[PDB]
Design an enzyme around this catalytic site. Structure first.
Site, PDB file in Angstrom:
ATOM      1  N   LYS A 124     -49.802 -53.208  18.883  1.00 50.68           N
ATOM      2  CA  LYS A 124     -49.931 -54.552  19.406  1.00 50.68           C
ATOM      3  C   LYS A 124     -50.364 -54.546  20.873  1.00 50.68           C
ATOM      4  O   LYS A 124     -50.445 -53.489  21.502  1.00 50.68           O
ATOM      5  CB  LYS A 124     -48.632 -55.319  19.179  1.00 50.68           C
ATOM      6  CG  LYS A 124     -48.312 -55.494  17.706  1.00 50.68           C
ATOM      7  CD  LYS A 124     -46.993 -56.224  17.477  1.00 50.68           C
ATOM      8  CE  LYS A 124     -46.750 -56.461  15.992  1.00 50.68           C
ATOM      9  NZ  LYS A 124     -45.451 -57.117  15.674  1.00 50.68           N
ATOM     10  N   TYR A 158     -50.676 -63.420   9.519  1.00 47.75           N
ATOM     11  CA  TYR A 158     -49.230 -63.697   9.525  1.00 47.75           C
ATOM     12  C   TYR A 158     -48.809 -64.993   8.800  1.00 47.75           C
ATOM     13  O   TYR A 158     -47.737 -65.550   9.066  1.00 47.75           O
ATOM     14  CB  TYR A 158     -48.720 -63.685  10.981  1.00 47.75           C
ATOM     15  CG  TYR A 158     -48.712 -62.301  11.561  1.00 47.75           C
ATOM     16  CD1 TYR A 158     -47.843 -61.341  11.075  1.00 47.75           C
ATOM     17  CD2 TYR A 158     -49.596 -61.931  12.588  1.00 47.75           C
ATOM     18  CE1 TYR A 158     -47.827 -60.051  11.589  1.00 47.75           C
ATOM     19  CE2 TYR A 158     -49.589 -60.642  13.107  1.00 47.75           C
ATOM     20  CZ  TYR A 158     -48.700 -59.705  12.603  1.00 47.75           C
ATOM     21  OH  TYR A 158     -48.670 -58.423  13.105  1.00 47.75           O
ATOM     22  N   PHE A 187     -40.578 -68.540  15.246  1.00 46.79           N
ATOM     23  CA  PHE A 187     -41.337 -67.614  16.106  1.00 46.79           C
ATOM     24  C   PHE A 187     -42.845 -67.576  15.814  1.00 46.79           C
ATOM     25  O   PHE A 187     -43.585 -66.816  16.453  1.00 46.79           O
ATOM     26  CB  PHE A 187     -40.756 -66.195  15.996  1.00 46.79           C
ATOM     27  CG  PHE A 187     -40.767 -65.632  14.597  1.00 46.79           C
ATOM     28  CD1 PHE A 187     -41.894 -64.989  14.096  1.00 46.79           C
ATOM     29  CD2 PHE A 187     -39.646 -65.737  13.784  1.00 46.79           C
ATOM     30  CE1 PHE A 187     -41.906 -64.473  12.807  1.00 46.79           C
ATOM     31  CE2 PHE A 187     -39.650 -65.224  12.493  1.00 46.79           C
ATOM     32  CZ  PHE A 187     -40.778 -64.593  12.004  1.00 46.79           C
ATOM     33  N   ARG A 238     -42.642 -47.599   8.273  1.00 43.75           N
ATOM     34  CA  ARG A 238     -41.569 -48.527   8.644  1.00 43.75           C
ATOM     35  C   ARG A 238     -40.411 -47.772   9.298  1.00 43.75           C
ATOM     36  O   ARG A 238     -39.854 -48.243  10.277  1.00 43.75           O
ATOM     37  CB  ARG A 238     -41.046 -49.300   7.428  1.00 43.75           C
ATOM     38  CG  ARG A 238     -42.089 -50.148   6.695  1.00 43.75           C
ATOM     39  CD  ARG A 238     -42.479 -51.395   7.454  1.00 43.75           C
ATOM     40  NE  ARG A 238     -41.461 -52.438   7.369  1.00 43.75           N
ATOM     41  CZ  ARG A 238     -41.546 -53.624   7.972  1.00 43.75           C
ATOM     42  NH1 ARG A 238     -42.619 -53.943   8.695  1.00 43.75           N
ATOM     43  NH2 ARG A 238     -40.556 -54.502   7.829  1.00 43.75           N
ATOM     44  N   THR A 278     -37.134 -54.635  13.698  1.00 44.56           N
ATOM     45  CA  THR A 278     -37.982 -55.628  14.343  1.00 44.56           C
ATOM     46  C   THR A 278     -37.595 -55.837  15.801  1.00 44.56           C
ATOM     47  O   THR A 278     -38.454 -55.937  16.679  1.00 44.56           O
ATOM     48  CB  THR A 278     -37.882 -56.967  13.616  1.00 44.56           C
ATOM     49  OG1 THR A 278     -38.061 -56.747  12.217  1.00 44.56           O
ATOM     50  CG2 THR A 278     -38.926 -57.937  14.142  1.00 44.56           C
ATOM     51  N   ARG A 312     -40.459 -48.677  18.173  1.00 43.47           N
ATOM     52  CA  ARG A 312     -39.976 -49.918  18.774  1.00 43.47           C
ATOM     53  C   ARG A 312     -38.904 -49.682  19.826  1.00 43.47           C
ATOM     54  O   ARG A 312     -38.984 -50.253  20.904  1.00 43.47           O
ATOM     55  CB  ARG A 312     -39.544 -50.921  17.707  1.00 43.47           C
ATOM     56  CG  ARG A 312     -40.758 -51.548  17.066  1.00 43.47           C
ATOM     57  CD  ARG A 312     -40.440 -52.213  15.758  1.00 43.47           C
ATOM     58  NE  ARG A 312     -41.517 -53.067  15.301  1.00 43.47           N
ATOM     59  CZ  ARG A 312     -41.521 -53.673  14.121  1.00 43.47           C
ATOM     60  NH1 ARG A 312     -40.502 -53.490  13.269  1.00 43.47           N
ATOM     61  NH2 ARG A 312     -42.541 -54.461  13.782  1.00 43.47           N
ATOM     62  N   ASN A 348     -43.033 -56.207  20.510  1.00 42.63           N
ATOM     63  CA  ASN A 348     -42.383 -55.101  19.810  1.00 42.63           C
ATOM     64  C   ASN A 348     -43.322 -54.006  19.303  1.00 42.63           C
ATOM     65  O   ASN A 348     -43.009 -53.323  18.328  1.00 42.63           O
ATOM     66  CB  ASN A 348     -41.472 -55.617  18.688  1.00 42.63           C
ATOM     67  CG  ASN A 348     -42.237 -56.117  17.484  1.00 42.63           C
ATOM     68  OD1 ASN A 348     -43.460 -56.305  17.519  1.00 42.63           O
ATOM     69  ND2 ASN A 348     -41.501 -56.364  16.401  1.00 42.63           N
ATOM     70  N   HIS A 390     -46.935 -53.110  14.241  1.00 42.27           N
ATOM     71  CA  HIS A 390     -46.868 -53.722  12.917  1.00 42.27           C
ATOM     72  C   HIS A 390     -47.059 -52.661  11.837  1.00 42.27           C
ATOM     73  O   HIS A 390     -47.799 -51.679  12.031  1.00 42.27           O
ATOM     74  CB  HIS A 390     -47.988 -54.743  12.749  1.00 42.27           C
ATOM     75  CG  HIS A 390     -48.104 -55.293  11.358  1.00 42.27           C
ATOM     76  ND1 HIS A 390     -47.561 -56.502  10.987  1.00 42.27           N
ATOM     77  CD2 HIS A 390     -48.694 -54.789  10.246  1.00 42.27           C
ATOM     78  CE1 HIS A 390     -47.812 -56.720   9.705  1.00 42.27           C
ATOM     79  NE2 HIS A 390     -48.510 -55.697   9.234  1.00 42.27           N
ATOM     80  N   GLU A 407     -53.393 -56.529   3.525  1.00 37.13           N
ATOM     81  CA  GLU A 407     -53.630 -56.265   4.951  1.00 37.13           C
ATOM     82  C   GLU A 407     -54.746 -55.273   5.245  1.00 37.13           C
ATOM     83  O   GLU A 407     -55.468 -55.453   6.191  1.00 37.13           O
ATOM     84  CB  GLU A 407     -52.330 -55.827   5.646  1.00 37.13           C
ATOM     85  CG  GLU A 407     -51.293 -56.946   5.607  1.00 37.13           C
ATOM     86  CD  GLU A 407     -49.924 -56.577   6.156  1.00 37.13           C
ATOM     87  OE1 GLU A 407     -49.728 -55.466   6.687  1.00 37.13           O
ATOM     88  OE2 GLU A 407     -49.042 -57.443   6.050  1.00 37.13           O
TER      89      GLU A 407
HETATM   90  N1  LIG Z   1     -37.415 -64.120  16.891  1.00 43.53           N
HETATM   91  C1  LIG Z   1     -38.685 -63.725  17.193  1.00 43.53           C
HETATM   92  N2  LIG Z   1     -39.303 -64.019  18.378  1.00 43.53           N
HETATM   93  C2  LIG Z   1     -40.564 -63.612  18.645  1.00 43.53           C
HETATM   94  N3  LIG Z   1     -41.279 -62.880  17.751  1.00 43.53           N
HETATM   95  C3  LIG Z   1     -40.782 -62.539  16.528  1.00 43.53           C
HETATM   96  C4  LIG Z   1     -39.423 -62.942  16.178  1.00 43.53           C
HETATM   97  N4  LIG Z   1     -39.163 -62.467  14.944  1.00 43.53           N
HETATM   98  C5  LIG Z   1     -40.266 -61.820  14.517  1.00 43.53           C
HETATM   99  N5  LIG Z   1     -41.229 -61.861  15.463  1.00 43.53           N
HETATM  100  C6  LIG Z   1     -42.583 -61.228  15.375  1.00 43.53           C
HETATM  101  O1  LIG Z   1     -43.153 -61.367  14.071  1.00 43.53           O
HETATM  102  C7  LIG Z   1     -43.424 -60.060  13.556  1.00 43.53           C
HETATM  103  C8  LIG Z   1     -43.318 -60.050  12.049  1.00 43.53           C
HETATM  104  O2  LIG Z   1     -41.991 -60.407  11.659  1.00 43.53           O
HETATM  105  P1  LIG Z   1     -41.292 -59.561  10.487  1.00 43.53           P
HETATM  106  O3  LIG Z   1     -42.364 -59.292   9.447  1.00 43.53           O
HETATM  107  O4  LIG Z   1     -40.029 -60.329  10.104  1.00 43.53           O
HETATM  108  O5  LIG Z   1     -40.817 -58.175  11.203  1.00 43.53           O
HETATM  109  P2  LIG Z   1     -41.453 -56.699  11.054  1.00 43.53           P
HETATM  110  O6  LIG Z   1     -42.670 -56.659  11.976  1.00 43.53           O
HETATM  111  O7  LIG Z   1     -40.350 -55.760  11.516  1.00 43.53           O
HETATM  112  O8  LIG Z   1     -41.792 -56.523   9.579  1.00 43.53           O
HETATM  113  C9  LIG Z   1     -42.456 -59.131  14.265  1.00 43.53           C
HETATM  114  O9  LIG Z   1     -42.803 -57.746  14.225  1.00 43.53           O
HETATM  115  C10 LIG Z   1     -42.494 -59.721  15.650  1.00 43.53           C
HETATM  116  O10 LIG Z   1     -43.650 -59.243  16.386  1.00 43.53           O
END
Ligand SMILES: Nc1ncnc2c1ncn2[C@@H]1O[C@H](COP(=O)(O)OP(=O)(O)O)[C@@H](O)[C@H]1O
Length: 142
Positions: free
Chosen positions: A12, A52, A60, A88, A94, A105, A115, A118, A129
């Site tokens: 990212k 997304y 978010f 993962r 996350t 992370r 973070n 992805h 994807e």
């Molecule tokens: N509470 C939050 N505030 C800001 N960004 C968020 C939040 N929750 C998730 N995100 C963003 O959305 C992305 C995708 O969410 P998710 O698919 O639930 O997590 P992951 O990336 O661990 O699979 C996260 O990696 C993060 O960049």
């Protein structure tokens, strides 16, 4: 043996700006995953929103999209045994504050707001994807 899988990875804009693309690539490569497609890009709003879409209703969503279009990203396809889960596991939780020590992370991010990485979370999402970002002629299994 486990199935050979392909998964979609994104470094990212935060981690790109930190100039730690190489360190993150080495996490994948040292875990036995191979970079089989790759491109640096700068996502449009539309593309980030599409990509997304699953989070379109989440609180978010707006922040995520602004974050993902805030600077260039490094996108790659990772291939190997159990690649999806393996990726993962390397990424960690996350929320970087909750991620295990030694994950990407934990090591390269400070908050859930930025973070670092992805990764596709299932076979179905991995397929969608990968096809979103690369034509098959630009993915090179080896
Ligand atoms: N509470 C939050 N505030 C800001 N960004 C968020 C939040 N929750 C998730 N995100 C963003 O959305 C992305 C995708 O969410 P998710 O698919 O639930 O997590 P992951 O990336 O661990 O699979 C996260 O990696 C993060 O960049």
């Amino acid at each position: 043996s486990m199935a050979l899988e392909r998964t979609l990875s994104i470094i990212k804009p935060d981690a790109v700006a930190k100039n730690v693309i190489g360190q993150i690539y080495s996490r994948f490569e040292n875990a036995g995953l191979k970079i089989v497609a790759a491109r640096m890009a700068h996502l449009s709003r539309a593309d980030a929103e599409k990509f997304y879409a699953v989070h379109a209703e989440r609180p978010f969503f707006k922040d995520l999209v602004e974050f993902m279009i805030s600077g260039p990203v490094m996108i790659q396809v990772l291939e190997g045994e159990d690649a999806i889960l393996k990726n993962r596991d390397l990424m960690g939780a996350t929320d970087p504050k909750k991620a295990e020590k030694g994950t990407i992370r934990a090591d390269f991010a400070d908050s859930i707001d930025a973070n670092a990485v992805h990764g596709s979370d299932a076979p179905e999402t991995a397929r969608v994807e990968i096809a979103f970002f690369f034509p098959e002629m630009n993915v090179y299994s080896r």
